[PDB]
Amino acid sequence: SMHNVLIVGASRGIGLGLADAFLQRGAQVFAVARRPQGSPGLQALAERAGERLQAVTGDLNQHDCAERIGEMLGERRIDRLIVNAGIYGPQQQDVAEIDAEQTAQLFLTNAIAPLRLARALSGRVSRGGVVAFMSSQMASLALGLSATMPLYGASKAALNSLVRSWEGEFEELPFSLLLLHPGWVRTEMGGDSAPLSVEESAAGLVAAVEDAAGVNACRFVDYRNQPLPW
Amino acid sequence: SMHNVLIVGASRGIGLGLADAFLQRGAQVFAVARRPQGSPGLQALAERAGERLQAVTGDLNQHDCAERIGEMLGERRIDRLIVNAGIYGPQQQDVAEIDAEQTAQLFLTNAIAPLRLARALSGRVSRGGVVAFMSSQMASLALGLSATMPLYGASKAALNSLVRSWEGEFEELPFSLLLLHPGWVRTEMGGDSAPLSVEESAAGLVAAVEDAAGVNACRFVDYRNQPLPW
Ligand SMILES: NC(=O)c1ccc[n+]([C@@H]2O[C@H](COP(=O)([O-])OP(=O)(O)OC[C@H]3O[C@@H](n4cnc5c(N)ncnc54)[C@H](OP(=O)(O)O)[C@@H]3O)[C@@H](O)[C@H]2O)c1
Ligand SMILES: NC(=O)c1cccnc1
Numbered sequence: 001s002m003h004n005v006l007i008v009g010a011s012r013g014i015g016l017g018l019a020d021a022f023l024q025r026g027a028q029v030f031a032v033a034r035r036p037q038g039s040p041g042l043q044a045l046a047e048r049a050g051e052r053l054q055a056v057t058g059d060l061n062q063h064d065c066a067e068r069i070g071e072m073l074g075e076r077r078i079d080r081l082i083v084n085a086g087i088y089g090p091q092q093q094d095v096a097e098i099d100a101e102q103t104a105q106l107f108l109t110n111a112i113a114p115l116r117l118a119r120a121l122s123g124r125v126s127r128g129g130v131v132a133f134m135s136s137q138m139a140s141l142a143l144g145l146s147a148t149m150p151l152y153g154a155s156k157a158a159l160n161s162l163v164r165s166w167e168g169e170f171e172e173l174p175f176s177l178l179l180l181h182p183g184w185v186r187t188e189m190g191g192d193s194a195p196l197s198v199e200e201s202a203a204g205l206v207a208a209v210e211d212a213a214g215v216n217a218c219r220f221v222d223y224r225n226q227p228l229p230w
Numbered sequence: 231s232m233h234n235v236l237i238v239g240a241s242r243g244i245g246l247g248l249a250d251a252f253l254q255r256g257a258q259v260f261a262v263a264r265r266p267q268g269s270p271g272l273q274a275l276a277e278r279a280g281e282r283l284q285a286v287t288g289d290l291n292q293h294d295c296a297e298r299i300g301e302m303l304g305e306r307r308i309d310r311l312i313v314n315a316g317i318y319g320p321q322q323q324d325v326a327e328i329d330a331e332q333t334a335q336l337f338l339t340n341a342i343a344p345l346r347l348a349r350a351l352s353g354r355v356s357r358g359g360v361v362a363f364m365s366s367q368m369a370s371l372a373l374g375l376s377a378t379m380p381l382y383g384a385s386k387a388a389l390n391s392l393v394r395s396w397e398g399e400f401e402e403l404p405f406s407l408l409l410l411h412p413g414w415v416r417t418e419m420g421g422d423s424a425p426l427s428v429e430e431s432a433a434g435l436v437a438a439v440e441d442a443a444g445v446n447a448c449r450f451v452d453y454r455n456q457p458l459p460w
């Protein structure tokens with residue numbers, strides 16, 4: 001079943017790493033970015049993979065994102081749908097200072113928009129496919145690591161909650177629903193202290209995604225496919 | 231020996247029931263509401279309890295809320311602080327339709343503002359006291375029951391996250407941190423429409439709050455003081 005892979009937010013970082021790693025496995029990759037032409041990484045993947053990498057212009061916060069993606073896919077089904085795009089929220093991560101506009105941006109971008117998009121595309125997802133949302137270990141209540149970055153963590157707890165609630169709408173899950181912790185990865189957000197490379201993270205995430213295909217389960221797992229507690 | 235109990239959001243519903251229940255125990259209650267004079271319930275409690283119920287105008291979303299509360303308390307320490315923020319969010323509970331203003335209102339009211347207020351008042355809380363936030367069963371990832379009300383549920387998962395993040399800022403808790411599920415006073419089952427009275431819910435929550443005094447723990451509990459999973 002691993003034919004058509006859609007990565008939402010693929011210009012750089014983990015998302016670009018995912019596009020690369022799925023291409024290396026022989027997938028047909030639809031790589032959505034806000035400004036694809038401005039991504040040297042995606043341009044380098046297009047050079048290498050040719051027509052197996054299709055760059056798609058799109059924006060997770062735009063309500064026409066699913067329609068653009070569908071117009072582009074035509075009748076093609078999505079085997080693996082990965083929502084990767086995200087933000088951090090205010091740099092000081094201070095619940096005492098975040099304002100209304102920041103709050104709306106943070107919870108729309110990191111929690112609501114992923115569900116809106118995935119839901120809008122869900123009828124095009126192959127039965128037995130995988131819909132995966134990049135989450136974080138900061139979303140875990142039990143781990144309690146969200147002190148490190150409380151606003152980001154809360155946004156990802158909200159994401160996890162909305163994915164569990166979507167699961168609850170189905171009498172029988174038609175695809176898997178994954179919440180993925182990529183590890184702490186050297187990206188613009190992750191910074192120089194992050195212990196994992198994008199390449200290591202993405203390799204593992206690809207395996208976790210593939211391990212859920214055909215299982216129709218909801219899992220919160222890391223890049224080693226190890227379960228994280230809620 | 232009369233404890234000082236501050237209830238933020240006390241004009242109706244469980245907030246009003248908590249004020250009533252604490253008054254019946256002999257506490258000094260400060261009952262904060264947006265428009266106290268327009269609450270017949272609070273007016274009836276003021277009439278019955280006299281000075282032991284102080285109905286205070288205040289709004290968790292206003293940037294002077296903590297300041298006004300403090301000016302009003304003077305040097306009185308807060309033995310029990312109960313934040314009964316809560317709005318449902320958009321009635322359709324639809325990620326495809328929620329806009330920026332609604333998103334800000336939902337996550338500020340239900341998650342961010344409660345923490346902002348509690349944190350600002352923290353130094354006035356009695357050591358060995360209790361700070362409690364009204365959460366919900368719908369916040370629980372493990373239960374996963376929030377399909378009917380996904381946005382409300384996600385807003386309360388965000389609350390639980392932010393409370394856990396605050397917990398992690400302390401080497402040892404100076405007071406308990408509770409997340410409360412009040413139960414369902416009304417259900418969508420016609421043959422089981424009213425399984426719990428507000429007065430029983432409030433009485434139960436008071437017992438749960440009192441059970442945490444002096445424990446200095448973080449607990450997610452219902453009105454029977456049963457633990458809910460995260
Ligand atoms: N790095 C880590 O250590 C780490 C740890 C835990 C979880 N995560 C999660 O893993 C995901 C990827 O993390 P990351 O560090 O590689 O990158 P990120 O900073 O979270 O996201 C950056 C990528 O998202 C795109 N993006 C942002 N907003 C977008 C929008 N409205 N529409 C379309 N694309 C948008 C960006 O494209 P532009 O080039 O156009 O900006 C970029 O490709 C995120 O969900 C993040 O929360 C990362
Ligand atoms: N989940 C993580 O460890 C994380 C999230 C965002 C930035 N850095 C690390």
Ligand code: NA
Binds near residue numbers: 187
């Ligand atoms: Na990056």
